[PDB]
Amino acid sequence: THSHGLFKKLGIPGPTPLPFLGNILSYHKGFCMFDMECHKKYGKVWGFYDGQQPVLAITDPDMIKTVLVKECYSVFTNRRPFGPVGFMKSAISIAEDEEWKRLRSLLSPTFTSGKLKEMVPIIAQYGDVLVRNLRREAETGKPVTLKDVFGAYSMDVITSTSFGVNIDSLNNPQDPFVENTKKLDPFFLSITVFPFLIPILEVLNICVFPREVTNFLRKSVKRMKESVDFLQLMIDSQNHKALSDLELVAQSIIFIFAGYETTSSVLSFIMYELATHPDVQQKLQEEIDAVLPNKAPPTYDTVLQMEYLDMVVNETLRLFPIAMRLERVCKKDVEINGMFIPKGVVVMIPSYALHRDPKYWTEPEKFLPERFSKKNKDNIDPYIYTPFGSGPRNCIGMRFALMNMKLALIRVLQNFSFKPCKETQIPLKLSLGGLLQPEKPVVLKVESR
Amino acid sequence: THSHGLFKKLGIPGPTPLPFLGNILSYHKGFCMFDMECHKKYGKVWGFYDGQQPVLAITDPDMIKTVLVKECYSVFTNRRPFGPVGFMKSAISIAEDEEWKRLRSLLSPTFTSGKLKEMVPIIAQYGDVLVRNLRREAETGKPVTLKDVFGAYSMDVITSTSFGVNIDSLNNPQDPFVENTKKLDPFFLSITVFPFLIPILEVLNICVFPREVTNFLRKSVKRMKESVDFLQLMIDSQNHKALSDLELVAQSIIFIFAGYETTSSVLSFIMYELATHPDVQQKLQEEIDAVLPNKAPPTYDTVLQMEYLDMVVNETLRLFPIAMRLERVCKKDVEINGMFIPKGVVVMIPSYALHRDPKYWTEPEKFLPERFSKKNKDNIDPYIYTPFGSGPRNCIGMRFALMNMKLALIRVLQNFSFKPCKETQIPLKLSLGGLLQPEKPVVLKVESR
Ligand code: HEM
Ligand code: HEM
């Protein structure tokens, strides 16, 4: 309890912390529920302790803007350091200060609309592979587990977008690439109450990324150095200061994790919503059939034209912002928008909490895509709604993730309809761990149109 | 052995490191001898590993200047972090980056010539107390242990210069202040090969500063908050951003350690030299008697006029630079004077090695004060001779230490002569630990004039 007196001496309200644990025992309902309760009983700002680490939650849109945009380069540059990371300290999302800046600048041209349009034909091919595997489990008449067919699709996209390795993950059970890209809680809570043990784990070459996948990828990069995708865009860039070969492998790993779990979990949440709201699902199929008459193939320009599709994605991401929280480490004693923030505090934006706050959303628990219609979108504050973050360190893959998910949705909805069944968890409950995912896997009935 | 390939891949020569240990086993002859050998068999630049930490030694005067002066604020701002330090991370010599800058700027006016002249009458009073205790152990006809009478004197000065607590440490064996200021290797080598254990020690409130002295000092500061010296100069300053009460206590502790061990060890080395060079001792007494006729009391202006005295101090500090090494942590990938220094390397200036190099000193092992005569002082390079460091982070107490030591020397030499005897270690051997101190304590015969 050496710093458990910081928020009292600053006059900031918060939950009283236990010795050593801080407030971590309040994470037992899940930490998005912890954030809603703290927001409800403390107001606009509050403090709590992850073990000995102080964390200041902020909910004011102006303060969020100072932190994420205004004062990003000078005070709030980095995220908080986590458990044994090893050589993945070079990954863009884990790197810090001038080193992050270099990586951000080197990887920015990789995610432009120009390059994204060149990837559309490639990821559209697996759209069709998805529809192929979907027609099959629809004949079973068995409720389908969406995270499997989506999980496989998301892997197919990422493998072919990051390395050009075209594969059918669902029908090729064990390819050296598909396997290795497949093999990837208590330890996180222990680390959080035992952060002084992270240096011991690092020196012992223990790494929260399974080191066995990482040797395989470096090899594959080598057997692909001379022998359009993210690898070449990064290799051609080497042909600031240029990237290195090992740095190359760290970014790719980050892209798989992003590409795989975020894309597959968001797509599942969407089809849950479309199944439990047949009117929305019907209206979306009518917009799709009108833009793309007679199951025509989706294109970059056609996708950017589907306003209701965009509305459904945005609203799904309001209810389930898969990063849950934004965080920045306070580098130096500062005073933002009337309050003093001392060095070393983690400032956290409770995105999940803000997305479900009645101060800004009417009926926050209701799936209502019309919030994001061109009429009501103007009243939505970009620092309350922050599914991809904001400012210089926001989600670099936002445009790629949106395109990738919409391309799957179009093709899947052109051919099938999705209905609940006796195994569907209605209402959906979220897991209580540290990931935003359903408690029970989403299972739905899939009928061919 | 994760980084033991850095100096090879950079083409920098050095001793081959063992796994885990690096080169620490070479510290067995002492690390000043390690630096002389490395300088002799590698040339101007070399690399070695304190466990896993790489350290680049530089001996070029130009590069030393880029590191200590030119590029201090931007790349080489801090010293290397050491073992459990606790709240002494606020001490000026341990603090880093913008935090060090604030402390440096807040404490600079405390060490000006103006304030130093105001301290002279105070520290001259213990000069006389020293002569009193010296006349006594001279009657014993017993060889005198100089570190005792000097150690006590150095404590008397520091206590009365930092807090106004006038005392006779040698004749008042146990005063609460003298005791506490008295109670203050294997663990250092273990830490160096086990740096990942420092966070474990910190969380357990284990601190290499004996925590028992530190609670007493905070109390004393309190019983001195309302109830000319370093404390008031720092308290009056509070009446950048102002200092705090706890920060106050960290700086004072640093001043005691500096004031006590450096002053007492340098004075002993001097009187060893004056005893083993009676001609120098005689000529110095003649300069003293001429400036200060008939044992007149020393003054600020009189001390700054004694050129030979200044010459003896400077030459003693050439042979025994008590900090041994200067160090700076490289904050960012840089290229200085033709060589690339990667982030996180410790750059070390081997002051002891440079002070005894034949490239710049004729007969380096000889005690020859005339090197520093007004004729030959001009040829001495201020980046080879660096007893107090150089640049913005040099010894802030240099003028105070010089005045304090000369005032002791004048008064002691006005009354006594110092001769070797059967117990004097001739030639003097240095200890092989991590401190520059004699192997056997200096003992000399002291005769009244
Ligand atoms: C629905 C899908 C996704 C969502 C909701 C999402 C959301 C986020 C969020 C909220 C952040 C934190 C931004 C901040 O701290 O302000 C982030 C960071 C990041 N995301 Fe995404 N992401 C998704 C998919 C992706 C994809 C597909 C990629 C790349 C292929 C990606 C790459 C990154 C990177 C590199 C960062 C760190 C940026 C930096 O540190 O500069 N994300 N993402
Ligand atoms: C013979 C006596 C002394 C010698 C040879 C000496 C030498 C040194 C050296 C070599 C450094 C390192 C400078 C660098 O890294 O470039 C240093 C730092 C320092 N010394 Fe001294 N010192 C002595 C006495 C003192 C005294 C009496 C005080 C204060 C009362 C003092 C206060 C300091 C401080 C605060 C620093 C750190 C400065 C910073 O980090 O900005 N020293 N000293």
Curated annotation (Swiss-Prot), chains A, B:
Q: Give the result of S190P, as annotated.
A: In allele CYP3A4*2; exhibits a lower intrinsic clearance toward nifedipine
Question: Pfam families, from UniProt?
Answer: p450 (PF00067)
Primary localization: endoplasmic reticulum
* Superkingdom per UniProt: Eukaryota
The membrane-topology field of this record reads: Single-pass membrane protein
User: Known SUPFAM superfamilies for this protein?
Assistant: Cytochrome P450
Q: In which pathway does it act?
A: Steroid hormone biosynthesis; Cofactor metabolism; retinol metabolism; Steroid metabolism; cholesterol metabolism; Lipid metabolism; fatty acid metabolism
The protein's PTM annotation reads: Polyubiquitinated in the presence of AMFR and UBE2G1 and also STUB1/CHIP and UBE2D1 (in vitro).
Please list the cofactors this protein needs.
heme
Gene Ontology, cellular component aspect: cytoplasm; endoplasmic reticulum membrane; intracellular membrane-bounded organelle
Keywords of this entry: Disease variant, Endoplasmic reticulum, Fatty acid metabolism, Heme, Iron, Lipid biosynthesis, Lipid metabolism, Membrane, Metal-binding, Microsome, Monooxygenase, Oxidoreductase, Steroid biosynthesis, Steroid metabolism, Sterol metabolism, Transmembrane, Transmembrane helix, Ubl conjugation
UniProt subcellular location: Endoplasmic reticulum membrane; Microsome membrane
Q: EC class of this enzyme? A: oxidoreductase
Look up what happens after changing L326F. In allele CYP3A4*12; has an altered testosterone hydroxylase activity
Report, as the record phrases it, the tissue specificity of this protein: Expressed in prostate and liver. According to some authors, it is not expressed in brain. According to others, weak levels of expression are measured in some brain locations. Also expressed in epithelium of the small intestine and large intestine, bile duct, nasal mucosa, kidney, adrenal cortex, epithelium of the gastric mucosa with intestinal metaplasia, gallbladder, intercalated ducts of the pancreas, chief cells of the parathyroid and the corpus luteum of the ovary (at protein level).
Function in brief: A cytochrome P450 monooxygenase involved in the metabolism of sterols, steroid hormones, retinoids and fatty acids. Mechanistically, uses molecular oxygen inserting one oxygen atom into a substrate, and reducing the second into a water molecule, with two electrons provided by NADPH via cytochrome P450 reductase (NADPH--hemoprotein reductase). Catalyzes the hydroxylation of carbon-hydrogen bonds.
- Disease as annotated in the protein's UniProt record: Vitamin D-dependent rickets 3: An autosomal dominant disorder of vitamin D metabolism resulting in early-onset rickets, reduced serum levels of the vitamin D metabolites 25-hydroxyvitamin D and 1,25-dihydroxyvitamin D, and deficient responsiveness to parent and activated forms of vitamin D.
Q: What is this protein called?
A: Cytochrome P450 3A4
Q: Which organism is it from?
A: Homo sapiens (Human)
